[PDB]
């Protein structure tokens, strides 16, 4: 049990539909072998060899055009040839999410895109579609605040995400999602520009 390798996903963790994604999995420690894996129903693990280009030891595990069922919790391992080399400790889990699959919500103005400092800017997500849950990206350089929506409230389906006290601004994206399929997200809502004057 050497030491969990890397497993970083670029150019994104959050992959679009039908497209490219290279799950790189390196370790400072030499690793003749690498193995990827995922907790999604319809799983697999790849036995790829490992390229040592530069004094590290990578493995560029390429996924195909992101089709639905490839989305899920990836996590590689590493080791040394021939008979079962037992693999090292599991790396830090990756959540590969396939987007572009459903309608783009609407990053709601209300309150409002241009607030004054220290006020309460609380974003939200409207959609006629039944997105059991929602998601919110970037806050100066952020990631995700994936939360559950409100019921069939006279048309829409919202998920008010409050940021209340505001000290900066930035762009945001809302991603519609269904319950029974957590990595299978929708399309991106037009990016919203919060800022502070």
From Swiss-Prot:
The gene is KIR2DL2. Disulfide bonds join 25-76, 125-174. Receptor on natural killer (NK) cells for HLA-Cw1, 3, 7, and 8 allotypes. Inhibits the activity of NK cells thus preventing cell lysis. One of its GO terms (cellular component) is plasma membrane. Belongs to the immunoglobulin superfamily. Keywords: Cell membrane, Disulfide bond, Glycoprotein, Immunoglobulin domain, Membrane, Receptor, Repeat, Signal, Transmembrane, Transmembrane helix. It comes from Homo sapiens (Human). The keyword NAD does not apply. The chain holds residues 25 to 221 of 348 of the full protein. Its main location: membrane. This is Killer cell immunoglobulin-like receptor 2DL2. GO terms for biological process: immune response-regulating signaling pathway. It is found in: Cell membrane. Residues 18-83, 118-181 form the Ig-like C2-type domain. Glycans are attached at residues 60, 154, 187.
């Amino acid at each position: 049990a050497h030491r969990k390798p890397s497993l970083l996903a670029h150019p994104g963790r959050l992959v679009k539909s039908e497209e490219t994604v290279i799950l790189q999995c390196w370790s400072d420690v030499r690793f003749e072998h690498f193995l990827l894996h995922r907790e999604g129903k319809f799983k697999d693990t790849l036995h790829l060899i490992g390229e040592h280009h530069d004094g590290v030891s990578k493995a560029n595990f390429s996924i195909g055009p992101m089709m639905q069922d490839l989305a899920g919790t990836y996590r590689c391992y590493g080791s040394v040839t021939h008979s079962p080399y037992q693999l090292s400790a599991p790396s830090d889990p990756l959540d590969i999410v396939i987007t572009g699959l459903y309608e783009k919500p609407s990053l709601s103005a209300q309150p409002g895109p241009t607030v004054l400092a220290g006020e309460s800017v609380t974003l939200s997500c409207s959609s006629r579609s039944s997105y059991d849950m929602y998601h919110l990206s970037r806050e100066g350089e952020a990631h995700e605040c994936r939360f559950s929506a409100g019921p069939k409230v006279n048309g829409t389906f919202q998920a008010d995400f409050p940021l209340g006290p505001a000290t900066h601004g930035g762009t945001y994206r809302c991603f519609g999602s269904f319950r029974d399929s957590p990595y299978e997200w929708s399309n991106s809502s037009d990016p919203l520009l919060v800022s502070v004057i």
